[PDB]
Amino acid sequence: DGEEYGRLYGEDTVPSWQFPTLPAANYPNSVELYNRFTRQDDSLVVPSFKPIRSKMDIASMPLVQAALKEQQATKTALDMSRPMFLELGRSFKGAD
Amino acid sequence: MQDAITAVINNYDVQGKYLDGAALDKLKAYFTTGAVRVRAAAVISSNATTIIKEAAAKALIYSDLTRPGGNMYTTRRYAACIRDMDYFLRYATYAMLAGDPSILDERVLNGLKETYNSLGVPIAATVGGIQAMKEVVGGLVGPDAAKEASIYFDYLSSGLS
Amino acid sequence: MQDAITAVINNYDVQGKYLDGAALDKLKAYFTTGAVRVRAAAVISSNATTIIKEAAAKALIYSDLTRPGGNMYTTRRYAACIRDMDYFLRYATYAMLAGDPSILDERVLNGLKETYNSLGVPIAATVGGIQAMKEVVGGLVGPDAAKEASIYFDYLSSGLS
Amino acid sequence: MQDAITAVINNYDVQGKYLDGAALDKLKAYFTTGAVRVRAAAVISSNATTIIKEAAAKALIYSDLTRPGGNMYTTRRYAACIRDMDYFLRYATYAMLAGDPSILDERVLNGLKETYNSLGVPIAATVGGIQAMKEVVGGLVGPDAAKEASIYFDYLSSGLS
Amino acid sequence: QDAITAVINNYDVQGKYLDGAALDKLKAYFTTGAVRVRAAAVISSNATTIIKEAAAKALIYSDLTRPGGNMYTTRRYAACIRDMDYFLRYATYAMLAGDPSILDERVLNGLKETYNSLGVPIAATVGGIQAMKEVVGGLVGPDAAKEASIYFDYLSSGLS
Amino acid sequence: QDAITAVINNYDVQGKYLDGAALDKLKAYFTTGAVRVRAAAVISSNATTIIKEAAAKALIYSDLTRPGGNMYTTRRYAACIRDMDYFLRYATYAMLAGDPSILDERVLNGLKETYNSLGVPIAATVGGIQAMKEVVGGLVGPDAAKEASIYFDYLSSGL
Amino acid sequence: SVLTKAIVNADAEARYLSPGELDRIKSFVASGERRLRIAQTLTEARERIVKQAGDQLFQKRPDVVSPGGNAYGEKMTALCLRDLDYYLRLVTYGIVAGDVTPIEEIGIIGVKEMYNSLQTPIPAVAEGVRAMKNVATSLLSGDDAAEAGFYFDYLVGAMQ
Amino acid sequence: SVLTKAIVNADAEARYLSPGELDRIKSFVASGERRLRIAQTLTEARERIVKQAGDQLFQKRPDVVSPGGNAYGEKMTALCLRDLDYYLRLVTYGIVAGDVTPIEEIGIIGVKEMYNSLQTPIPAVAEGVRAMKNVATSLLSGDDAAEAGFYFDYLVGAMQ
Amino acid sequence: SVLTKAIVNADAEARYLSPGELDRIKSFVASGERRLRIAQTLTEARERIVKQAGDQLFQKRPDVVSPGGNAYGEKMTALCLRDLDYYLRLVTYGIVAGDVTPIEEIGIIGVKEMYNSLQTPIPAVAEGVRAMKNVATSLLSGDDAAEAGFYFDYLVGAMQ
Amino acid sequence: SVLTKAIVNADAEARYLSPGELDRIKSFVASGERRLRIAQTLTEARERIVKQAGDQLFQKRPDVVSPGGNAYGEKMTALCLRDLDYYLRLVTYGIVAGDVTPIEEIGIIGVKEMYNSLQTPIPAVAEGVRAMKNVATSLLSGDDAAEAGFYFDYLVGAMQ
Amino acid sequence: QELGTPINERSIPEMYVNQGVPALKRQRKVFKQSQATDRESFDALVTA
Amino acid sequence: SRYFKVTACIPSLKRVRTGRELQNTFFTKLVPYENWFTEQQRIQKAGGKVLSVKLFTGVQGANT
Ligand SMILES: *[C@H](C)[C@H]1/C(=C/c2[nH]c(/C=C3N=C(/C=C4\NC(=O)C(CC)=C4C)C(C)=C\3CCC(=O)O)c(CCC(=O)O)c2C)NC(=O)[C@@H]1C
Ligand SMILES: *[C@H](C)[C@H]1/C(=C/c2[nH]c(/C=C3N=C(/C=C4\NC(=O)C(CC)=C4C)C(C)=C\3CCC(=O)O)c(CCC(=O)O)c2C)NC(=O)[C@@H]1C
Ligand SMILES: *[C@H](C)[C@H]1/C(=C/c2[nH]c(/C=C3N=C(/C=C4\NC(=O)C(CC)=C4C)C(C)=C\3CCC(=O)O)c(CCC(=O)O)c2C)NC(=O)[C@@H]1C
Ligand SMILES: *[C@H](C)[C@H]1/C(=C/c2[nH]c(/C=C3N=C(/C=C4\NC(=O)C(CC)=C4C)C(C)=C\3CCC(=O)O)c(CCC(=O)O)c2C)NC(=O)[C@@H]1C
Ligand SMILES: *[C@H](C)[C@H]1/C(=C/c2[nH]c(/C=C3N=C(/C=C4\NC(=O)C(CC)=C4C)C(C)=C\3CCC(=O)O)c(CCC(=O)O)c2C)NC(=O)[C@@H]1C
Ligand SMILES: *[C@H](C)[C@H]1/C(=C/c2[nH]c(/C=C3N=C(/C=C4\NC(=O)C(CC)=C4C)C(C)=C\3CCC(=O)O)c(CCC(=O)O)c2C)NC(=O)[C@@H]1C
Ligand SMILES: *[C@H](C)[C@H]1/C(=C/c2[nH]c(/C=C3N=C(/C=C4\NC(=O)C(CC)=C4C)C(C)=C\3CCC(=O)O)c(CCC(=O)O)c2C)NC(=O)[C@@H]1C
Ligand SMILES: *[C@H](C)[C@H]1/C(=C/c2[nH]c(/C=C3N=C(/C=C4\NC(=O)C(CC)=C4C)C(C)=C\3CCC(=O)O)c(CCC(=O)O)c2C)NC(=O)[C@@H]1C
Ligand SMILES: *[C@H](C)[C@H]1/C(=C/c2[nH]c(/C=C3N=C(/C=C4\NC(=O)C(CC)=C4C)C(C)=C\3CCC(=O)O)c(CCC(=O)O)c2C)NC(=O)[C@@H]1C
């Protein structure tokens, strides 16, 4: 009833092996399925998709890294739209 | 897939922590970078066909591959190779907007080595093509974008190799 | 799969060579053999049921296999074994027309050993049955056809071994 | 390992058959070819260093590999790569004398892909080097030897890829 | 399809380039748009309740629910509330679109024939739709209600 | 089916073995056959042009092609020329076969109903078929034309 | 996130991001800073929002904190409040993301099944979220409140 | 248009429109007024755009208006200009819609087949569209031109 | 080849080859010897066919071998001729096979995409193939020429 | 540069810089960083811009690269491309300066006289610059392209 | 001639055939009801 | 079990087809009651128009 079946097989065509390029492991996985004879191997081609760890943190990427330096370095300077007398009285280190 | 904003959220969610200022700062950093990224992406999309052409000329073509008995010999194989090149480019563009390399792992990188080995596609040549595309892309996007663009291209290359 | 004509073409195409006299001679050889092969194929198709019957009688039946505790014991297993025999016959006929062993490798031979080992089907007995079919087939087809038919049967047997 | 003489013997032994004239003819064929093979082997051994040098010049060197961050960068890696090249040459020579490709499978080919992948050595570049060595070898050995020499080199290349 | 596309299609069959009069209709739609978006969000959040209230008003405590009635048995009851949901969802879609066509293409097409074969009573269904309209009108508020009402009425007229 | 099979089928319902009279009808077909093969080759080579000419005669420069017409928009135009090709290919098949049955089994069956649902105008389509016939007649030459014409007319009558 | 959603649609179509889609991304990144502030406000007021909402919920539903009811007892009442806290954290995540997807994966899929095993009443949970919304709205400025409301409404819709 | 697309995705999922989807609809309705102006400009300049583009095309391709060429002769030249006019009308429709879909259904599907039967060269048609783009760009302001360019580029891509 | 095609259909049906299929094989084997001679003729004349066709093509299309054009320069001109040689080799393969399938896999699938990346004009390539056909036809006897023509025509049809 | 111009006007008047003049200097220094990026982009893409523009020019003007024409021959063609490269370098200089003056002194004064002695056609040179502009525009973002366009247009205006 | 020969020999031609997506993908046949309008076609459909 | 007999026409809007495809355009079919709902939706989503629906088997308004 789903759309995939409807898009490609329609109402009058017998399904066939797709041999898909596209999603990613799909081609190699499908082809292992197609190559097996009945009862040849009962084992799952895909038990389930294992979830993937992160190699790189957000901060390591150059554009973010730069923007962090800009806020971090020169976090404390002089604020515009702030009267100077209030700005001179403001503390930088705060606690510690 | 995952993006920088979601990555921060996910890290906090596993901790169970509410979003904090330090986290907010990382999010803020991303937001500033965003505008640059969008400009880069538009450049890449417009010049995609040319980028592929140039890269192929640099590495793939005029070679044994294109000569009979080579992997890229026959129209069908040639067309497949340039289609793959386009995929890499599109996904890299997605990654650059996202600010995360995860999408590359989830879609492109997963099972690629195995697919290529079964097909008999040469990995090193493919990597060469990716590197070539990177160089071309770097020029078009301009310097600020280039560094960001390069990392995703390198990530793809490292995965394949 | 491939046939003899296409096999020659493909070998030349990878070399990039235009067809040459030596290649032509191989093609010419095939063309003469062709008429004989067509006649042989028709003979086999008509007598297929009998061929299987005779071969089974020679090797499979009146044996421990058919007796309880044997692989071909129970109707279901008996039927499976004769179905497999028919497969071998049909594919060998295809190969004989084609003049190429490749189809056997692509369809029959690939994964058969592994399938049989999981099933616990005995390979040596199967090979025996194939050889028996060959002998029966040889008679029906006649001598000129028999030589051609034999090579494909032997190819199947060697693969299973 | 296995050689042509032993291969014939082994095939007969599994059949349990005593050696027959047809088998003898194959053995006789090998014996005639032997003299040519020995001459080829001596040529290769004497010119081994040069063969490697030429092949490296053709494919490996003056390239990104040799440039910093490349696989063949650093003296240690460079030396390793030329050592591997020598291995391939020595084994091919052994195979040519033997008249059998089995030794290549047993020693060189087994586990090579996996080793290279862990190391991060590029397979396609290695294959390129093997092909280059083949071309050089073909010249030195001369025409009769060349065809025989080429098949073993091609076998290595196909295995790696 | 959509109000914007409907105008375009009418012009395309004429072969006429878009003109100011056409543009004015498009402009009218654009102003109404913001109201419609707000209404749609209200409906989506309150959808379950809207259906409940409408059923209470018309369907339940009735002969239909009593044995021998069309909506008797759990299976039939569930079917009727499923249909109610669809009418609501499609009406919401129509309101955003500004066009009645989607109702014709999705809801209205083949409904009458299905209902007649089933023996589902059309007038009762229409009653339910009208009840939903009344409940929806309250939640959306007056400006939105007028817009919402036309699509509900369109559904009712089609079924009848 | 085919002229040869038609004769066979007529005999089979009678249960009669093949007779000389029957053989004569088959013989008649065999003589015509050579002409038909030549005609078919002509049509196949000139098929694109035949369609072009016929379209020029009837379909284009018309209200249909103008906006609000059935053949307006590229998609509809392409569909109409695809249909024209179908008619041509099947008529060629029928001419070789020597039997109108194939037209009934494939082309004619359900076409009227399909067209009515689509809103395609049957009379215009028939006009196009007649135009193709005229063009085909020229190319095939007179002897072939008579044979070709009957199948075209059969399609037109069915539609 | 908004950006993830856009990328996903593009990938399905197998196309590069459209200019229009790119423009929406640009708008989102500009909006983000405002969104961060809204989230920050709720985080600071989190403890009070939960407390106030809890009290309102218990007043609205005496039964839940009754000897029969699931919420009754100190341990159980704490767990009910912990759940409210969880949902608030999810809402904050949603506001920064600009999409309900983060909220949805953590909290709304399988929620029915989990609560049914627990035997917690789903409608009561929804009421608690509604209560939290009202408290949160008061602390937020009107335009900020509207943004926050959408995410709160989604949760209420999900738990229905 | 964008709105139709959003509705269609929702209907496939059988779900009410997501907040994010609703937001995109809101953005589109705001953009529409600007879009209408861009379309209006091109409509007014339509006659001149076609004329100028035609001349450029004929200069670029002498062959098309030559005894061999398809365009040659008054009748044929008129038809070639009519085609250019058609494509311009489609582009205007696209700009107001905010999507290429309206353009695509009327002009880009089966276009190759139609022109091949006509024997008109497809590349020449593409050049004409490119020519029209250049004329249109000059009359439009830069930002307006960029928007218009996208639709023009799509047409050129489609007819390739 | 014809034989491959027949086998493949049989395998799908899981049946032995039909008598009709067998008959076609018989016809093909009889034809083959004639076909081999036709192929041999073209192979011997290959060098001249390519040269003559190239000259004709360059006369027909001055532009391709012009500073702007792709073919311009010795390196490029050689590549253009190499392409023509490739197509001729494919045609010979086709004649011996008795079907276009061998030709089709190597040369006609993805051809558009490959040439578009290269930026080579497809129509010019088609003209070159047509030119080769004319040269080849002259060397072949009339009946042989007709057979060869079919394969040449297919190539021209494939590439436009 | 902007700064030089302002200083020169002041010295003529023998006065300190006016506030208005100072403001323009301030604006320029802010713009500079953006300008530097635009210049950098074109420098990186320089090789491709020249190549693409050259091809376009040669297609537009077959004659220049013809035995009669000045550009004909490898030596001459190289010189023509070198000239195009020179003009591109000048354009980059212009963008950073914020004025055409740098461009003007090096390239636009005496240009007519130089080319007339060489016998190079000035209009062809102008076409080449136009071609370079189009290539450059594509690589640049829209706003960046507009800035770059002004300098390109000046060159085209200077050379006729 | 040189630009269409392989740079490297291709000394075992079989290896270089049967590289890529396997031929199976192309060999297979598709079956539809529109082709079914014959008694044999229908039998093939069903077997498929 | 109840069955539905449905006649529906679906146009091929995405692509022109070389194959005749008469059956795909115009089809009369028997649908299980449970399946029909989903099928009806799918025809609507395709943009096909369902001319006629009838209940082939079973009795309307039957409790069992
Ligand atoms: C000649 C009529 C036209 C022409 C040809 C041309 N081709 C190239 C480059 C290549 N063409 C091919 C083509 C093939 N490879 C295949 O496998 C097949 C089927 C067997 C074909 C036909 C390839 C692969 C290349 C790339 C180079 C390589 O082989 O490695 C060029 C030059 C490339 C360039 O653009 O720089 C040319 C000129 N060009 C014309 O304009 C003629 C109309
Ligand atoms: C190009 C640089 C190289 C090249 C390409 C090449 N690829 C194939 C076949 C396949 N390509 C893929 C790969 C992918 N699927 C995915 O989802 C992704 C990530 C998004 C990738 C990169 C697949 C699955 C296939 C097989 C299926 C298919 O083709 O549809 C081929 C073989 C194609 C053929 O028809 O035989 C080739 C040649 N080969 C080269 O030589 C370059 C180095
Ligand atoms: C007797 C009622 C009729 C009859 C019997 C008959 N059978 C055979 C030979 C075989 N029968 C079997 C059957 C089975 N094997 C099983 O495992 C089972 C299920 C438990 C059955 C029923 C088999 C396998 C054989 C082959 C011999 C063998 O066992 O190895 C024959 C001999 C004929 C022959 O060609 O072998 C006969 C006569 N036939 C009649 O005419 C009787 C009416
Ligand atoms: C007969 C001489 C021997 C024998 C056979 C036997 N086979 C099976 C089961 C299977 N056989 C096959 C084999 C094939 N499928 C293919 O596609 C091909 C190539 C075309 C082959 C050869 C398969 C896959 C099966 C499993 C599924 C099925 O049964 O259809 C059995 C049944 C074994 C079981 O445990 O069920 C038997 C008995 N038995 C003998 O002992 C003979 C020597
Ligand atoms: C200079 C004093 C002497 C000299 C040098 C020379 N070297 C080459 C070529 C190469 N040399 C290197 C060396 C290195 N690669 C490494 O990784 C390291 C350590 C970091 C070194 C030092 C390499 C790799 C090459 C190969 C080329 C390449 O880089 O790809 C040459 C020319 C090569 C040739 O023989 O053709 C020369 C001349 N030669 C002298 O005679 C000087 C005494
Ligand atoms: C009692 C154990 C619980 C309870 C019952 C309750 N039911 C309703 C309302 C309805 N109940 C039904 C039930 C059926 N109709 C059927 O056809 C069948 C299958 C044979 C059943 C079981 C229906 C249809 C209604 C709707 C009203 C009507 O019949 O017209 C209510 C009232 C709720 C309302 O708002 O109408 C109640 C209270 N309530 C509990 O909490 C008890 C645990
Ligand atoms: C409820 C307000 C009234 C009611 C409804 C009712 N409907 C059915 C069964 C079906 N109704 C439909 C209708 C649709 N299918 C669609 O695709 C659409 C558009 C989205 C609609 C509106 C269909 C197809 C069925 C059959 C199967 C199904 O469940 O979908 C029933 C059950 C009748 C039966 O005999 O089983 C009922 C009760 N009837 C009333 O009592 C209310 C007035
Ligand atoms: C001009 C750029 C080129 C050109 C045009 C040309 N066209 C025709 C004839 C027709 N063109 C069309 C096109 C359309 N009809 C539509 O409905 C649409 C989509 C909205 C299009 C684009 C059609 C259908 C015709 C047929 C006539 C008609 O419609 O009334 C001709 C005349 C040729 C003929 O045989 O009719 C010409 C010359 N020709 C070129 O070479 C220019 C590059
Ligand atoms: C052209 C002469 C006239 C014309 C044609 C036209 N046809 C369609 C659509 C279809 N036509 C068919 C017909 C067939 N399918 C078959 O299998 C056969 C027999 C082999 C025929 C003749 C079908 C099924 C369709 C549907 C679409 C499809 O691709 O299958 C159209 C399109 C109408 C629409 O809106 O869909 C047109 C225009 N109409 C004219 O105006 C000409 C007079």
Rg (CA), chain K: 20
Concatenated DSSP letters for chain G?
-HHHHHHHHHHHHTSPPPHHHHHHHHHHHHHHHHHHHHHHHHHHTHHHHHHHHHHHHHHH-TTTTSSSSTT-SHHHHHHHHHHHHHHHHHHHHHHHHTSSHHHIIIIISSHHHHHHHHT--HHHHHHHHHHHHHHHHHHS-HHHHHHHHHHHHHHHHH--
Phi, psi of D61 (to 5 degrees): -85, 180
With 0-12 / 13-18 / 19 or more C-beta atoms within 10 angstroms meaning exposed / middle / buried, residue H20 is: buried
C79 lines ligand 3 (CB under 6 A): no
Written as six digits, the tokens of B62 are: 């005029």
Distance (angstroms) between ligand 6 centre and the Cα of E60 equals 10
Q: What does the alpha-carbon distance between residue B70 and residue K19 come to, in Å, rounded to a whole number?
A: 9
Our answer on whether L and C touch (3+ beta-carbon pairs < 8 Å) is no
Q: Chain C partners of I97 at a C-beta cutoff of 8 Å?
A: 5-6, 9
Written as six digits, the tokens of H145 are: 């031109």
Task: Supply the residue whose CA is at minimum distance from atom 15 of ligand 4.
Answer: A37
Written as six digits, the tokens of D90 are: 């020595």
Buried b (16+ CB within 10 A) or exposed e, F29-67: beeeeeebeebbebbeebbeebbbbbbebbbbeeebbeb
Residues G152, G42: contact at Cβ < 8 Å?
Answer: no
Residue L29 parent element (H or E)? strand L26-32
According to DSSP, the residues that pair with L29 across neighbouring strands are L6
Written as six digits, the tokens of B25 are: 């700062």
Residues B37, G42: contact at Cβ < 8 Å?
Answer: no
Residues B137, B149: contact at Cβ < 8 Å?
Answer: yes
Integer angstrom CA distances of residue F91 from D83, E22, F30, F138, F154: 73, 48, 19, 16, 9
Using CA coordinates, name the residue in chain B closest to J136: B140
Question: B45 — contact with chain G (CB < 8 Å)?
Answer: yes
Concatenated DSSP letters for C97-111?
HHT-SHHIIIIIITT
Q: Chain F partners of E14 at a C-beta cutoff of 8 Å?
A: 67-68
Kindly tell me the sign of the dihedral angle through the C-alpha atoms of I134, I137, I143, I144: negative
DSSP alpha helices (H): ranges in chain J?
Answer: 2-13, 19-44, 46-60, 74-97, 101-103, 111-118, 122-139, 142-158
- DSSP state, K7? S
Q: What does the alpha-carbon distance between residue H122 and residue H64 come to, in Å, rounded to a whole number?
A: 11
Written as six digits, the tokens of H143 are: 């930002």
Please identify which residue in the block is written with the tokens 């002259």: I138
B58 lines ligand 2 (CB under 6 A): no
Query: Is E93 annotated as a binding-site member?
Result: no
Written as six digits, the tokens of K28 are: 């297979």
Residues B71, B64: contact at Cβ < 8 Å?
Answer: no
Residues I36, I28: contact at Cβ < 8 Å?
Answer: no
From first CA to last CA, the distance across chain B in angstroms is 23
Q: What does the alpha-carbon distance between residue A71 and residue A81 come to, in Å, rounded to a whole number?
A: 19
Residues D70, D121: contact at Cβ < 8 Å?
Answer: no
Taking the CA of residue F79 and the nearest CA in chain L, the distance in Å comes to 6
CB proximity list for F154: less than 8 A, separation 6 or greater: F94, F100, F103
C12 lines ligand 3 (CB under 6 A): no
D62 CA: nearest ligand 5 atom: 30
> Which residue in the set G150, G153, G160 is minimally distant from E48, CB to CB?
G160
CB contact under 8 A, E13 and F68: yes
Neighbours of E14 (CB within 10 A): 10
Residues G150, H19: contact at Cβ < 8 Å?
Answer: yes
Resolution rounded to one decimal, in angstroms: 2.8
E77 CA: nearest ligand 7 atom: 38
- Secondary structure of chain A as H, E, C letters: CCHHHHHHCCCCECCCCCCCCCCCCHHHHHHHHHHCCCCCCCCCCCCCCCCCCCCCCHHHCHHHHHHHHHHHCCCCCCCCCCCHHHHHHCCCCCCC
Taking the CA of residue H10 and the nearest CA in chain J, the distance in Å comes to 35
CATH number of the domain that C132 lies in? 1.10.490.20
Residues A29, A46: contact at Cβ < 8 Å?
Answer: yes
Neighbours of E74 (CB within 10 A): 7
Using CA coordinates, name the residue in chain K closest to D158: K15
Long-range contacts formed by A37-40: CB under 8 A, 24+ apart:
A37/C111, A37/C112, A37/C115, A38/C115, A39/C115, A39/C118, A39/C119, A40/C111, A40/C114, A40/C115, A40/C118
Phi, psi of L52 (to 5 degrees): -140, 140
Please calculate the CA angle B17-B19-B20 and round it to the nearest 5 degrees.
100
SS3 C49: helix
SS3 K12: coil
- Structural domain count, chain B: 1
Name the residue range of residue B114's domain.
1-161
- Candidates C9, C44, C1, C49; CA nearest to C26 is C9
Neighbours of B129 (CB within 10 A): 22
Buried b (16+ CB within 10 A) or exposed e, G22-52: bebbeebbeebeebbebbbbbbebbeebbeb
Kindly tell me the sign of the dihedral angle through the C-alpha atoms of L3, L6, L12, L13: negative
- Candidates L44, G34, H7; CA nearest to E36 is H7
Residue L31 parent element (H or E)? strand L26-32
Q: What does the alpha-carbon distance between residue C101 and residue C152 come to, in Å, rounded to a whole number?
A: 7
Distance (angstroms) between ligand 6 centre and the Cα of G130 equals 27
Written as six digits, the tokens of J78 are: 């190289």
CB contact under 8 A, H111 and F74: yes
Buried b (16+ CB within 10 A) or exposed e, H102-131: bbbbbbbbbbbbbbbbbebbeebbbbbbbb
Q: In what order do the strands lie in the sheet with L49-57?
A: L26-32, L3-9, L49-57
Q: Chain H partners of J142 at a C-beta cutoff of 8 Å?
A: 142-143, 146
Q: What does the alpha-carbon distance between residue K38 and residue F102 come to, in Å, rounded to a whole number?
A: 11
Q: Are strands L26-32 and L3-9 parallel, antiparallel or unpaired?
A: antiparallel
F94 lines ligand 9 (CB under 6 A): no
CB-side neighbour CA atoms (13 Å) of C48: 19
- DSSP state, K32? B
F106 lines ligand 9 (CB under 6 A): yes
Q: What does the alpha-carbon distance between residue I28 and residue C6 come to, in Å, rounded to a whole number?
A: 14
Phi, psi of I128 (to 5 degrees): -60, -40
CB-side neighbour CA atoms (13 Å) of G58: 18
- Candidates I25, I36, I155, I42; CA nearest to I100 is I155
